[PDB]
Design a protein around this nucleic acid. Sequence first.
DNA 1: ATGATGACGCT
DNA 2: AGCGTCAT
Length: 430
Amino acid sequence: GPHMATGQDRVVALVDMDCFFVQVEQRQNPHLRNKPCAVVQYKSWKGGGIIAVSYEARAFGVTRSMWADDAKKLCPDLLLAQVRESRGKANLTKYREASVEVMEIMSRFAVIERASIDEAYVDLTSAVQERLQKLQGQPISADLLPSTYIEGLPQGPTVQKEGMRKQGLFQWLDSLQIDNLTSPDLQLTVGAVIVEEMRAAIERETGFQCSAGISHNKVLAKLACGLNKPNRQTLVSHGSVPQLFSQMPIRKIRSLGGKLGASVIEILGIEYMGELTQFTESQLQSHFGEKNGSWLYAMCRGIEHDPVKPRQLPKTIGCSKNFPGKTALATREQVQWWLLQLAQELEERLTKDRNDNDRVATQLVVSIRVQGDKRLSSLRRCCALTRYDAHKMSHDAFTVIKNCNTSGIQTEWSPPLTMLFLCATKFSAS
DNA sequence: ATGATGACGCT
DNA sequence: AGCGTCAT
Ligand SMILES: Nc1ccn([C@@H]2O[C@H](COP(=O)(O)OP(=O)(O)OP(=O)(O)O)[C@@H](O)C2(F)F)c(=O)n1
Ligand SMILES: [Ca+2]
Ligand SMILES: [K+]
């Protein structure tokens, strides 16, 4: 009872750009705005692979991974924008630079953790304490929360979507104890006000819309963010967790979408995250290990402690290209030419990074895949990265992979290579 | 023949 | 270090 921690100590938000690469292309080309459209890479093989999809196009069934030729069968008027191609490969620079625009706006409000090109976690605990002191116990108006959903409401004793949203918000705000400065529900609500302001600033200063989740930890914030997209935000309170989790498939929780979650389902014979509450901590640790078991015991009760790490920049800078089916590299000269292409893009991104961010990479990771393996990587080897020079990096990568060549002939490469990857890691300040 | 990324855990 | 898992 009085000593049972409830995981209500932080206010954490997750901000996610809606269909991000599509928004970047629609900002640049107004002809694409408010249309079914997608971003594709390459074009020769079946129209290119779709990597991002506008919500108008999702209504027709267009998804990521689809070939554009097939997407066109579902949506004949689908508009397409192509990823830039440089040195024979996809170049994502435009989207990395757009992400920096958004991340720098977010950093004005709070320290952020860059989770991906288009996602950032925000720890709002301190910002919320300050805003509460500025209020001094004045109520929070619904006008301060114009795009916020309160998960689980309305409830209890209109048929339109915005009407539903406002009924739920009204019930939430009418129940709020605004005199208690340490009420977790109040803290979440103030967090949501700040996230409304953050999202307004992102849209004003970049043109990009996003969704967001606000809760007490990263897993609940990510789950919340997904509940109402696009261009909306959702508050998931601690009290909403039992009902929410009672029908939540286990695979929807971050880190449980793969083999571990499938094993939770198979071993325990359950389907929903709330069903985990019926096991002891020791039972869960016995099945899934000490760390995973403790994590599952707390997480199915809405409790998680993973911190929002203060990190706005990526930790690695990598360049990779697949060579599928018949295009697999079968000669020494082919392998050197593509290693050089990758190393030239890498050198350009590293030089830009060292000028912008005052750091240098010190380790070069080289990874390859051979025709036949089912694993995404067949071999990974590191060497020293001492100069930002593409010819040296490609020579060193070749040196650390050249003994993989099964061929007895010097000029041939067997088994042919279906993937090349160069990654700069282990940054030091400079 | 999805592809091109990127973070973190295990041993 | 090198390999694997999970995710955008
Ligand atoms: N497998 C993937 C997943 C994503 N992305 C790239 O990562 C970006 C963001 O990934 P997101 O958040 O998962 O999906 P969204 O497009 O933003 O759509 P939503 O509104 O539902 O958030 C994509 O634009 C991308 F461009 F598509 C990718 O390259 N490969
Ligand atoms: Ca997104
Ligand atoms: K995302």
